[PDB]
Design a protein around this nucleic acid. Structure first.
Ligand SMILES: Nc1nc2c(ncn2[C@H]2C[C@H](O)[C@@H](COP(=O)(O)O)O2)c(=O)[nH]1
Lengths: 112, 50, 50
DNA sequence: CGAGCAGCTACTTGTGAGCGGATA
DNA sequence: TATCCGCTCACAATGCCACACGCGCTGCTCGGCC
RNA sequence: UUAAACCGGCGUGUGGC
């Protein structure tokens, strides 16, 4: 079962970290074990009124929790790409992901 | 004595223990222990004996 | 006989290699997604980090 | 729009105490 | 199940004075209550 | 309300005792 594991990374370039993680998936055709990135930094203000239009299209913590059924080779893959500061979770280093109710919560956050 | 004090005997478990000592945890399955042990001493990029 | 002296040249070369590995990582991250026949090999590299 | 975060070492030595630990 | 043996970490390392220098760039994301 | 009066933080390097 492709669970939704949460991971923290080198912030700032978090979107580019997600794209590099995707490139590393598609390199070793890891889409069998893996899913997508779910970076729902999608608070979508567009107040493009007078005197200012630069609206903050992005708002979400720097977590890029990825759907995947975890394997130790998969863990060392997601750690092999740079900018993976913390693969968080209660464990030595092999964690348990967030439950499905928070999957519904992140669906709400995406839709909003 | 250095052999009998070593809890691991095969290269497999030896790699697991040397990885646990190198990087605390990160449990591999014959994937990252060997890679790190080969990249630590035998890689020309991370070893520059002139 | 067991102590070696390094002059300005060796330390400058060490710092240059420290910058070169960083710009190598940069051009590796830039080439991982770059396509063919789009640019000249000038924007792939940067001068501010070195 | 402004501000904050962030990405582009290996010889110190001693002294001491607290914490496994191992060994009957 | 008690008693040394060894592992691991904290804490410390004369005092003053004088001089000088350097303490970054740009992109993203988040904070919103004058 | 009015007048007068006053208003070195850090690191680094070097050197000396
Ligand atoms: N009209 C009016 N503007 C005010 C008042 N107080 C502050 N402002 C204006 C001046 C400031 O530049 C601006 C807010 O600036 P900034 O976003 O903090 O609000 C007020 O009492 N009235």
């Amino acid at each position: 079962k492709k669970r939704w594991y949460v991971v923290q990374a080198f912030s700032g370039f978090e979107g580019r970290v997600a794209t590099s993680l995707r490139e590393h998936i598609k390199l070793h055709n890891m889409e069998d074990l893996f899913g997508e990135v779910m970076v729902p930094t999608e608070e979508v203000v567009e107040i493009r009124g007078g005197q200012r239009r630069k609206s903050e299209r992005k708002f979400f913590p720097g977590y890029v929790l990825v759907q995947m059924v975890m394997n130790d080779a998969s863990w060392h893959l997601v750690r092999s790409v740079p900018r993976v500061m913390g693969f968080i979770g209660g464990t030595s280093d092999r964690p348990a992901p967030i439950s499905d109710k928070e999957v519904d919560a992140i669906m709400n956050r995406l839709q909003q | 004595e250095t052999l009998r004090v070593d809890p691991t005997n095969d290269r497999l478990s030896a790699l697991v223990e040397i990885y646990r000592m190198m990087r605390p945890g990160e449990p591999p399955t014959r994937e990252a222990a060997e890679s790190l042990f080969e990249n630590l001493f035998f890689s020309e990029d991370r070893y520059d004996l002139s | 006989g067991n102590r070696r002296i390094r002059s300005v040249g060796e330390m400058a070369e060490n710092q240059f290699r420290v910058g070169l590995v960083r710009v190598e990582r940069a051009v590796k991250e830039r080439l991982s997604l770059g396509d063919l026949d789009t640019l000249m090999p000038q924007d792939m590299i940067n001068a501010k980090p070195i």
